[PDB]
């Protein structure tokens, strides 16, 4: 197309001059490939535009002026694509083939900046999973590398978190992962234009990893942030949205209706929704119902007020940080929960005014006493 | 010749990232600077120059006021290579820079690489040009742009700064080809010829 043909030649091509781009064999092969608007990732500002998703075999021809990458197009400039774009060529040996050539070239030849490649090469391996073992091992090195680093790119972690998520992505621990990816979104949050099939499907898997999180609930979340419409919409996002509904409603068969394989694939949410319903009931039962120095909630009818029954209360309510969360204790006899905090919460408008009132109340009144004492 | 303070405005930018003639534009900038500045300090000893970042996402001084090598020292280290216009700001800094220029009776001068596509507004540009002429700055520019950066602010600007030429502004817009900047500008009254006003 114009971008490649017109851009490849005029683009750079000449950035850039008598290079391998517009060289005999060179200009042919694109023309040989196409002018047809799908292309090879076109050498600077337009390859800087072009991820172009016909596989670059200017694989070689990007790789020109890369000896000149000193004095030529120079930046990261490379895993900007290729190591990004042909990282997306999606083979097994492919990446591995250029993983040692790029990591040993842009780190040795050109070196003898790479850290973001160091992660790409390392990170990119981990897409291939190969074996969480080798992944995590150098991943944690990739992490361990990353640790001390003050790195202007989020791209490093935007590599890494995605990467480390990718690691957990192979795995459970979405408590980590979802969060880890939740981290990654907050990392992608400033930068990195992406695609929707990248956007939602991740955020899906994210929204999914909310489920295969589930959690220290959560409840409410990044759903606020533009994963929504975006994610939901529809398909399992309906669920994923309806699950957010169950993250509030907490009716089994408003959902255990909905359940197909994928969600029933982990049935443990049927426990998690009980975990929800309790906690879901609890949080507001906690957040408000007592306001009046909230604690007691003790137990049973209050615990059956979760509309989950009393002998499960004898577990669910009984369990506390055996829920991972709750504090306090049990009066078995009087059927009283002892409770304490480990409950966070939200909303606005209300105690706002109350706040300053008492706190200006003593305050003002103090001044009476607060009259002469150390003064006089 | 010159008793005046100067500023060197370097964009290390979409052009400087990219060799306009050996070894890079940004590098082609470099020894041309010293070349210039040599003749600048040969214009007179005590002739002072600034060096800033018009490059990158951060404007800043790279080398402050001096008069010898400490610039050539300072310029020695890199910059963001692909960076972007702070020019107006950078200039407006370079202006304020010259407002602190040391042991005045040194007139204000500025030397500006254009390695950027040059995004700015004409009035702002000329407000600069005004502010310069107000401040009475000597302004000469190094520009090899796409096309070049010209038929544009840079062209109005040198005019807009200028009631008297080198007491306000002269221009050169750097050409491509085996055009050595220091060799090129050896022609232009950016350097040599008449050097200050």
Curated annotation (Swiss-Prot), chain A:
Is Zinc a UniProt keyword of this protein?
no
Q: What else is known?
A: Present with 12400 molecules/cell in log phase SD medium.
Q: Which domain of life is it from?
A: Eukaryota
Among the GO molecular function terms of this UniProt record, one is: structural molecule activity
Tell me the name of the encoding gene. RPN9
Biological process (GO) annotations?
proteasome assembly; proteasome-mediated ubiquitin-dependent protein catabolic process; ubiquitin-dependent protein catabolic process
* Domain spans labelled PCI: 176-344
Function comment? Acts as a regulatory subunit of the 26S proteasome which is involved in the ATP-dependent degradation of ubiquitinated proteins.
**What is the protein name for this chain?**
26S proteasome regulatory subunit RPN9
Answer yes or no on keyword Transferase: no
Swiss-Prot record, chain B:
Q: Which GO terms describe its biological process?
A: proteasome assembly; proteasome-mediated ubiquitin-dependent protein catabolic process; ubiquitin-dependent protein catabolic process
Keywords assigned = Proteasome, Ubl conjugation
Q: Does the keyword Ubl conjugation apply?
A: yes
Recall the GO molecular function terms of this protein's record. Answer: K48-linked polyubiquitin modification-dependent protein binding; polyubiquitin modification-dependent protein binding
Q: Does the keyword Ubl conjugation apply?
A: yes
Q: How is it modified after translation?
A: Ubiquitinated, leading to its degradation. Ubiquitination is promoted by HUL5.
Gene Ontology CC annotations of this record: cytosol; nucleus; proteasome complex; proteasome regulatory particle, base subcomplex
Task: Briefly explain the null phenotype.
Answer: Cells are viable.
Pinpoint the VWFA domain residues: 5-190
* Subunit comment: The 26S proteasome is composed of a core protease, known as the 20S proteasome, capped at one or both ends by the 19S regulatory complex (RC). The RC is composed of at least 18 different subunits in two subcomplexes, the base and the lid, which form the portions proximal and distal to the 20S proteolytic core, respectively.
Q: What is its biological role?
A: Multiubiquitin binding protein.
Report the family membership: Belongs to the proteasome subunit S5A family.
Q: What else is known?
A: Present with 17200 molecules/cell in log phase SD medium.
Recorded protein name is 26S proteasome regulatory subunit RPN10
Q: Please name the source species.
A: Saccharomyces cerevisiae (strain ATCC 204508 / S288c)
Its ancestry begins with: Eukaryota, Fungi, Dikarya, Ascomycota, Saccharomycotina
Q: Which residues of the full protein are shown?
A: 1 to 197 of 268
């Amino acid at each position: 197309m114009f971008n490649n043909h017109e851009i490849d030649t005029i683009l750079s091509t000449l950035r850039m001059e008598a290079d391998p781009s517009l060289h005999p064999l060179f200009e042919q092969f694109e023309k040989f490939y196409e002018e047809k608007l799908w292309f090879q990732l076109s050498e600077s500002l337009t390859k800087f535009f072009d991820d172009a998703k016909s596989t670059p075999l200017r694989l070689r021809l990007y790789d020109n002026f890369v000896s000149k990458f000193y004095d030529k197009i120079n930046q990261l400039s490379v895993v900007k694509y290729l190591l990004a774009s042909l990282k997306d060529s999606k083979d097994f040996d492919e990446s591995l083939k250029y993983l040692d050539d790029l990591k040993a070239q842009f780190q040795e030849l050109d070196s003898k900046d790479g850290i973001l490649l160091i992660d790409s090469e390392i990170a990119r391996t981990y897409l291939l999973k190969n074996d969480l073992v080798k992944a995590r091992d150098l991943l944690d090195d990739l992490e361990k590398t990353l640790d001390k680093k003050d790195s202007i790119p989020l791209r490093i972690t935007n590599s890494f978190y995605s990467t480390n998520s990718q690691y957990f992505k192979f795995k459970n621990d979405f408590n980590s992962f979802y969060y880890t990816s939740l981290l990654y979104l907050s990392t992608l949050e400033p930068s990195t234009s992406i695609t929707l099939a990248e956007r939602q499907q991740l955020a899906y898997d994210l929204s999914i990893s909310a489920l295969l999180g589930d959690k220290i609930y959560n409840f409410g979340e990044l759903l606020h942030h533009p994963i929504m419409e975006t994610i939901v919409n529809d398909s399992n996002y309906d669920w994923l949205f309806q699950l957010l509904n169950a993250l509030t409603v907490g009716d089994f068969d408003k959902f255990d209706s909905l359940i197909k394989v994928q969600i029933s694939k982990i049935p443990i949410l049927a426990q998690h929704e009980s975990f929800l319903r309790q906690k879901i009931c609890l949080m507001t039962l906690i957040e408000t119902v007592f306001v009046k120095n909230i604690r007691m909630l003790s137990f049973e009818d209050i615990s059956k007020a979760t509309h989950l029954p009393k002998d499960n209360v004898e577990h669910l309510v009984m369990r506390a940080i055996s829920l991972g969360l709750l504090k306090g204790s049990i009066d078995q006899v009087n059927e009283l929960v002892t409770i304490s905090w480990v409950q966070p919460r939200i909303i606005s408008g209300d105690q706002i005014t109350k706040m300053k009132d008492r706190l200006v109340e003593w305050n003002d009144q103090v001044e009476k006493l607060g009259k002469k004492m150390e003064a006089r | 010749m010159v008793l005046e303070a100067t500023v060197l405005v370097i964009d290390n930018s979409e052009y400087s990232r990219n060799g306009d003639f050996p070894r890079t534009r940004f590098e082609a900038q470099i020894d041309s600077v010293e070349f210039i500045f040599q003749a600048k300090r040969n214009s007179n000893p005590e002739n002072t120059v600034g060096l800033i970042s018009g490059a990158g996402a951060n404007p800043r001084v790279l080398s402050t006021f001096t008069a010898e090598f400490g610039k050539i020292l300072a310029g020695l280290h890199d910059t963001q290579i692909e960076g972007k216009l702070h020019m107006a700001t950078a200039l407006q800094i370079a202006q304020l820079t010259l407002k602190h220029r040391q042991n005045k009776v040194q007139h204000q001068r500025i030397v500006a690489f254009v390695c950027s596509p040059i995004s700015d507004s004409r009035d702002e540009l000329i407000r600069l040009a005004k502010t310069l002429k107000k401040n009475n700055v000597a302004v000469d520019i190094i520009n090899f742009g796409e096309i070049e950066q010209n038929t544009e602010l840079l062209d109005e600007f040198i005019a807009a700064v200028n009631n008297p030429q080198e007491e306000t502004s002269h221009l050169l817009t750097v050409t491509p080809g085996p055009r050595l900047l220091y060799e090129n500008i050896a022609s232009s009254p950016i350097i040599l010829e008449e050097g200050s006003s």
